[PDB]
Amino acid sequence: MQYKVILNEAVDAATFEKVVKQFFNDNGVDGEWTYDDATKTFTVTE
Amino acid sequence: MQYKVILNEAVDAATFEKVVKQFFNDNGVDGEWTYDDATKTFTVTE
Amino acid sequence: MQYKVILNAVDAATFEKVVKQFFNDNGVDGEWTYDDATKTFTVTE
Amino acid sequence: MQYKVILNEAVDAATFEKVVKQFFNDNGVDGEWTYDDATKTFTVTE
C-alpha cells in the first residue's frame, strides 16, 4: 500500500517529514526522505 | 524516466492500452499492463 | 510539495490515524481516500 | 484510471511522447507533456 500527502503555511513540511520519520523510529525502523527521479504527465490543455 | 497518462473528454481505455502495447511491439518490446498496489492520498476536506 | 510513503511489521491503520491526527492538530481536517487505479506497462525483456 | 510507463531500450522517449500525444489529438483532445512537481519518498534503510 502506497500513501501520498501534498503540502501546498497550513502545515509545515519539515515538521511533517519529522513526524513520519519519528513514527518509523518509534516502530524500530530507520529511513530517510529520498528525492524521487523526475517524472512527466500528459496534461490536457482544457 | 517515468511517464504517466491519466484517462477520466471520454477516450477508450482498451484502445489506449492496445495502441501503447502495439507501439512497444513495433519497437521490439514485449510487455503487459500490470496493476499497481493501491495509493491513498490524504485529501483535505476543504 | 508531494510526499510518498510505502508500507508492505508496521501497522497501516495506525499510520493513517497518526497522520490524520497530525493534520487535525495543525487545524486541517481530511480523510484518506483511494486514488483511481494505476496500471504500469510491465516490460518482460 | 492512470497509466505508467518507465523508460531508460531501443524505444525512444521522444517518439513515445509523440505517439501518445498523437493518440489524444486523434481522439479530439489536445494536451502537452508537463513535468510533475518534485516528490520525496521515505526510504527505509533496510
Neighbours of chain A (3+ CB pairs under 8 A): B, C, D
- Please indicate whether, in this complex, the C-beta atoms of A34 and D44 are within 8 angstroms of each other: no
**E strand or H helix that includes residue A29:** none
Nearest-angstrom CA–CA distance, D33 and D20: 10
Main-chain dihedrals φ then ψ at residue C26, nearest 5 degrees? -100, 20
The number of C-alpha atoms within 13 Å of C42 and in the hemisphere containing its C-beta is 8
A42 strand-pairing partners: D33
Nearest-angstrom CA–CA distance, C41 and B16: 12
Method of determination used here: X-ray
CB B38 within 8 A of CB C35: yes
This structure's resolution (Å) is: 2.5
Nearest-angstrom CA–CA distance, B21 and D20: 11
The CA-to-CA distance between both ends of chain D, in Å, stands at 32
Q: Number of structural domains, chain A?
A: 1
CB pairs under 8 A between A and C: 58
- Distance in Å, alpha carbon of A41 to nearest chain D alpha carbon: 6
Strands (E), C1-45: 2-6, 30-34, 38-43
User: Which residue do the cell numbers 477508450 mark?
Assistant: B12
- Please indicate whether, in this complex, the C-beta atoms of C3 and A7 are within 8 angstroms of each other: yes
Q: 10 Å Cβ neighbour count for B28?
A: 9
Taking each helix axis as running N to C, give the angle between helix D13-25 and helix B13-26, from 0 to 180 degrees, rounded to the nearest 10. Answer: 150
Q: B23: domain range?
A: 1-46
Nearest-angstrom CA–CA distance, C19 and C30: 10
Contacts with D, B 22-41, CB within 8 Å: 23-24, 27-29, 33, 36
CB A33 within 8 A of CB D40: yes
C-alpha cell, D38? 518534485
Nearest-angstrom CA–CA distance, C18 and C25: 10
Query: Residue A4: which CATH number?
Result: 3.10.20.10
Q: DSSP letters of chain D?
A: -EEEEE----S-HHHHHHHHHHHHHTTT--EEEEEPPPEEEEEE--
